Amino acid sequence: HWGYGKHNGPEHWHKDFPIAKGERQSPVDIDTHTAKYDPSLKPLSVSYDQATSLRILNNGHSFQVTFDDSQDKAVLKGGPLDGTYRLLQFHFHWGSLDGQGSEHTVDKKKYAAELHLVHWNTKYGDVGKAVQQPDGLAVLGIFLKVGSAKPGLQKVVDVLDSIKTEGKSADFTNFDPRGLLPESLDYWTYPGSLTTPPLAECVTWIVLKEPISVSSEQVLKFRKLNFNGEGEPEELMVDNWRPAQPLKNRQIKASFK
Ligand SMILES: [Zn+2]
């Protein structure tokens, strides 16, 4: 399959997924002097108090925490969105060194990692239908910088030993994703795509201005996960990020001055 190596990485993906060269691919560089302040953008509404996490799993390209999305329990509304989007999963992208790892960049600056909270539009009934629609998904992107530890991340860090290799999963209940959010919800937004295959152009991106800080010890434990399955030669799971794609005929909007 596809991956992040020399022989199967992002520069190869277009051969199996020709939309890789499409008109609204992600991630992009956010040029802060070209982003347009839009006063008609409304504040984000993040309602996660009733979130029910289920499992954590190594899927061979990242690790994901999955949630119960059978009811409106953890939802994202407002901002640039119409209607209600349910939280499905979150996952990360990170680097081998602290100056790389994020997918979006800000004035070409890379962060050490990027957190994606993936939500789908309830009017389409299930997430599979939503991926077929230009407004089907909303992904909330949060940058990680290395500094002080993030206490709300430690429960994720401490379970990573149990999902070291591809295909492993573990029970991961009662995790509160509100502990991963920055203080401010100011954001940029633009229409884009999934950043992994199938690279579907179905995503409203909401990228928060304020990074969260995590400690060197916390990010170091991300870098000990494996791309390989158990009993295979060890390949560290690092640099699972797609490089920035051409902005083409799109405008990035900012919620703030
Ligand atoms: Zn992602």
Ordered domains of the chain (ranges, CATH): 1-257 (3.10.200.10)
CA separation, residue 62 to residues 39, 43, 89, 95, 117 (Å): 36, 30, 12, 12, 13
C-alpha to C-alpha distance for 28 and 207, rounded to whole angstroms: 11
Kindly give the distance from the C-alpha atom of residue 93 to the centroid of ligand 1, in angstroms, as a whole number.
Answer: 6
Q: Which amino acid is at 211?
A: P
C-alpha to C-alpha distance for 246 and 257, rounded to whole angstroms: 25
Kindly give the distance from the C-alpha atom of residue 60 to the centroid of ligand 1, in angstroms, as a whole number.
Answer: 13
Sequence length of the chain is: 257
Q: Which of 12, 61, 104, 119 is catalytic?
A: 61
Please report the DSSP string for 18-58 in residue order. Answer: GGGGSSS-S--EE-TTTSEE-TTPPPEEEE-TT--EEEEEE
66 is in an annotated binding site: no
116 is in an annotated binding site: yes
Give start and end residues of each alpha helix (H) in the chain.
127-130, 154-159, 216-222
Burial of 11 (0-12, 13-18, 19+ CB in 10 A): exposed
Contact 63, 92 (CB under 8 A): yes
- Give me the residues near ligand 1 (ion), CB cutoff below 5 Å: 116
The tokens describing 105, both together, are 């960049």
Kindly give the distance from the C-alpha atom of residue 83 to the centroid of ligand 1, in angstroms, as a whole number.
Answer: 22
**Nearest-5° Cα angle at 241, 139 to 105:** 70
93 is in an annotated binding site: yes
Kindly give the distance from the C-alpha atom of residue 91 to the centroid of ligand 1, in angstroms, as a whole number.
Answer: 6
User: Does the annotation mark 61 as catalytic?
Assistant: yes
C-alpha to C-alpha distance for 224 and 235, rounded to whole angstroms: 9
**Experimental method used, please?**
X-ray
91 is in an annotated binding site: yes
12 is in an annotated binding site: no
